């Protein structure tokens, strides 16, 4: 009868094949998010907003695609975008219009990017623009927000969850984390004296904005704007990782929000039609390190980089996120969402809290829904919350027809309404008194 | 004149060359890409034919980089994708298919106990390299000069620039203070290396046959002196085959050099002619990928393993395997370079087509006869010059006919003897036109 119990019961076919899959994959997965005590689910079939089981059992989906599903799974101008592009080749040893075509459009939608090459994913991505950065400047240092995540690329992989005091990660290079300095969210003084130390060895200041997993961990729009103008005076680069935001807040990027231009601009996910790719742009000048006719000539290549497939999908996803006003209505999506939520947890006098901006939210445990301040979330001064209760509640959506990401965190796409948010009210409400029954929730 | 007759046979691909030169450096978005004074724009693929935007059809010998093993649009892989597609891409969870597609990895490669999904070749030997490093918890890394194994920071510098073993630009001094470099086949620096830094290497990695796929050929035993080496030296051996992969053998090419990597590196053909990659190896050296190790590397990917990728990578696996896929293009291959080193031979050429495998190099300036690359491996032959390598793909696209980069040729399970006699009839008329306009 408990939520653990219950939860091997509904997923009998999924503890089959993770068994398999543990025999051949490290914890039984390919990517550590997806780690799940006792078992993940097994996915074989999505469409729209709902995916369903191995076991057949159908669930309303809040994380498919991490953000890059901005509409949804298989959006038929998308999927027949793919079609087309498939009956027509991958790889043809050559360039091709599509890539030029999907390339157009992330020009027109970002006027601070005049050149770009495209990328395998997100975390090559990344890993090219502090390439670009330090080739172009000269310079040695990369100055990173600590929890921001831009990859798991070397360059990355420190500070990030762990090894907040700037030690290196396991198999991280220590003259690679020598070469990285860390500053926390929103400490604007920490900043400043991170400058005025080091400004001209830093070759760029790279940072996700909104926050580490778009704000999970708050960042304020104005502590990025005094960074990108510190970056400007002392001659470092600003990146801004837009993987995440890019197609999902507004047709021209966060950076329109922030009123920054970034250097470079690091663009997946919806930018890439919801298949695999990325992107990055940038300054003429800065870019120009990519040409064959450079004295600081960066080596970029890639077999599946900018092919049509992903090309297809990219610019039949563009133009409909465009076409159909996407952004402004899963922003009022989220807004409506993050306010139900916020309110069903006053009405069961919970001090539960839904944040965030944009088309989605998250949850802090422990906080009131009344709370304007998210200040104590991104100084960490709040307490992590119980990880039984956490896993508990994920394990309860399930059983109750709904699936969310991480610790608490929703995304809205094209295809949600508001039924489905209140459906989401109406979940979570069954939830936590099963969380109530088993003495999981703590007031 | 080659150039002007390119020119106007490729009167849209200026047009769309014009804007692309728009918005990506030099009109491309790989380097492998920049052609002077423009390269094709590819609208369509099929079997081993692709057609421009002009509408001039070519027969392709490169399409893939040699991941279209089983060439363009296979009705196997194409259904396939299609079937995958119309079930989702992203479920944020996992899906039977990443399993199946894994399971048939393991099957192929018994040295591989358990494995990780990547997004590119390039993901691929960064996590092995990362791997190796946490494992051993050593820093060096020792690579073949010119060995390719993407264009991350680790493999940047000695690849085609900085042989000294300076950095590339870019490259944290410190990344170059940590890389090794050796001359292929140099057996001697090799020892001499693993004597004065053995303790602190943390892998060796190789490309088998050669710096990419035998363009500078490595010998088969080279690498195994290596992998021992490095097994005595408590370094690991990462065998990079990227490229062999599903092409030499059902296998890999560590079965044909009776080998045990303790990592192994898969992409192109491993992934069905889509994107993705696969790292493998050990049970231990795998282990640190593990949630519960005490030396954790973060690992992610929003698309890795996805259902595309891993739809197209079994239906591509099955076909190869029940369809003997590989001894069929190792054949042609024999058959391509001995007709190839044949024509030379009729035309008096000093030329030389060598290789192994399911393709073919060429290199200006060696008989046709010769048995012995080693003059290739030690950088003794002048590489050819790149005007006439320029003006001979151009010659031959006149020709309707596509190959590599600097006269390179992979083969597919499309291709057919009458393709590689229509290649070698085309070669016969291009070295002529070479001739005529004295660029040989």
Same mark, same amino acid.
């Given at each position: 009868?408990?939520?653990?119990?219950?939860y091997?019961?509904k !997923?009998?076919?999924?503890?089959f094949?993770?068994?398999? +899959?543990?025999?051949?994959?490290? %914890?039984?997965?390919?990517?550590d998010?997806r780690?799940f005590? /006792?078992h993940?689910?097994?996915i074989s079939?999505?469409?729209?907003?709902?995916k369903?089981?191995?076991d057949?059992?159908?669930?309303?989906? &809040?994380?498919?695609?991490?953000g890059?599903?901005?509409?949804?799974?298989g959006?038929?101008?998308?999927n027949?975008?793919?079609?087309?592009?498939?009956?027509?080749?991958?790889?043809?040893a050559?360039?091709? /219009?599509?890539?030029v075509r999907?390339a157009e459009?992330?020009? +027109?939608?970002?006027?601070?990017?005049? *050149?770009?090459?495209?990328?395998?994913?997100?975390?090559? !991505?990344?890993?090219?623009?502090?390439?670009?950065? @330090?080739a &172009?400047?000269?310079r040695?240092?990369?100055?990173?927000?600590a929890?921001?995540?831009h990859?798991?690329?070397? &360059?990355?992989?420190?500070?990030?969850?762990?090894?907040?005091?700037?030690?290196?990660?396991?198999?991280?290079?220590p003259?690679?984390?020598k070469?990285?300095?860390?500053?926390?969210?929103?400490?604007?003084?920490?900043?400043?004296?991170? =400058?005025?130390?080091?400004?001209?060895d830093i070759?760029?200041f790279?940072?996700?904005?909104?926050g580490?997993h778009?704000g999970? $961990?708050?960042?304020?729009?104005?502590f990025?704007?005094?960074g990108?103008?510190?970056?400007r005076?002392?001659?470092?680069?600003?990146?801004?990782?837009?993987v995440?935001?890019?197609?999902?807040?507004?047709?021209?990027?966060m950076?329109?929000?922030?009123?920054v231009?970034?250097?470079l601009?690091?663009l997946? *996910?919806?930018?890439?039609?919801?298949?695999?790719?990325?992107?990055?742009?940038?300054?003429?000048?800065?870019?120009?390190?990519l040409?064959?006719?450079?004295d600081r000539?960066?080596?970029?290549?890639?077999? =599946?980089?900018?092919?049509?497939?992903?090309?297809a999908?990219?610019?039949?996803?563009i133009?409909?996120?465009?076409?159909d006003?996407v952004?402004? *209505?899963?922003?009022?999506?989220?807004?409506?969402?993050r306010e139900?939520?916020?309110?069903?947890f006053?009405?069961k006098?919970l001090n539960w809290?839904?944040?965030?901006?944009?088309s989605?939210?998250?949850?802090?445990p422990?906080? /009131?829904?009344n709370?304007?301040?998210?200040?104590?979330? $991104?100084?960490?001064?709040v307490?992590?919350?119980?990880? *039984?209760?956490?896993?508990?509640?994920r394990?309860?959506l399930?059983?109750?027809?709904?699936d969310?990401?991480?610790?608490?965190?929703?995304?809205?796409?094209?295809?949600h309404?508001?039924?489905?948010v209140?459906?989401?009210? !109406?979940t &979570?409400? @069954?939830?936590?008194?099963?969380?109530? %029954?088993?003495?999981?929730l703590?007031?």
């Amino acid at each position: 009868g408990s939520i653990l119990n219950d939860y091997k019961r509904k !997923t009998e076919g999924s503890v089959f094949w993770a068994q398999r +899959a543990r025999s051949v994959m490290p %914890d039984g997965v390919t990517a550590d998010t997806r780690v799940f005590d /006792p078992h993940g689910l097994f996915i074989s079939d999505a469409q729209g907003v709902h995916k369903t089981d191995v076991d057949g059992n159908v669930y309303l989906d &809040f994380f498919g695609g991490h953000g890059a599903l901005v509409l949804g799974h298989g959006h038929p101008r998308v999927n027949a975008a793919i079609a087309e592009a498939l009956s027509h080749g991958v790889q043809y040893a050559a360039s091709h /219009p599509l890539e030029v075509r999907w390339a157009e459009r992330i020009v +027109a939608a970002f006027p601070s990017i005049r *050149k770009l090459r495209f990328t395998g994913s997100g975390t090559e !991505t990344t890993l090219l623009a502090l390439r670009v950065a @330090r080739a &172009f400047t000269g310079r040695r240092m990369i100055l990173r927000i600590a929890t921001h995540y831009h990859g798991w690329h070397d &360059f990355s992989a420190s500070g990030y969850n762990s090894h907040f005091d700037g030690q290196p990660a396991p198999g991280v290079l220590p003259e690679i984390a020598k070469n990285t300095l860390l500053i926390r969210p929103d400490d604007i003084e920490g900043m400043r004296e991170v =400058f005025a130390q080091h400004g001209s060895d830093i070759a760029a200041f790279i940072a996700e904005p909104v926050g580490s997993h778009f704000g999970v $961990t708050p960042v304020s729009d104005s502590f990025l704007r005094e960074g990108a103008e510190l970056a400007r005076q002392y001659g470092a680069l600003f990146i801004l990782d837009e993987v995440i935001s890019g197609f999902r807040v507004g047709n021209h990027g966060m950076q329109a929000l922030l009123d920054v231009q970034p250097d470079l601009t690091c663009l997946a *996910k919806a930018s890439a039609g919801g298949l695999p790719g990325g992107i990055l742009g940038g300054r003429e000048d800065v870019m120009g390190v990519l040409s064959r006719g450079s004295d600081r000539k960066v080596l970029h290549q890639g077999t =599946f980089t900018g092919n049509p497939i992903t090309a297809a999908a990219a610019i039949a996803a563009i133009d409909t996120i465009l076409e159909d006003d996407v952004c402004a *209505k899963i922003n009022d999506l989220g807004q409506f969402a993050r306010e139900a939520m916020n309110h069903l947890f006053a009405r069961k006098g919970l001090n539960w809290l839904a944040y965030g901006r944009f088309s989605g939210f998250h949850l802090m445990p422990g906080l /009131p829904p009344n709370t304007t301040d998210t200040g104590s979330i $991104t100084r960490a001064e709040v307490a992590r919350p119980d990880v *039984k209760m956490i896993a508990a509640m994920r394990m309860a959506l399930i059983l109750e027809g709904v699936d969310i990401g991480g610790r608490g965190s929703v995304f809205l796409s094209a295809q949600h309404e508001r039924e489905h948010v209140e459906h989401l009210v !109406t979940t &979570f409400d @069954r939830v936590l008194d099963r969380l109530a %029954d088993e003495n999981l929730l703590s007031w």
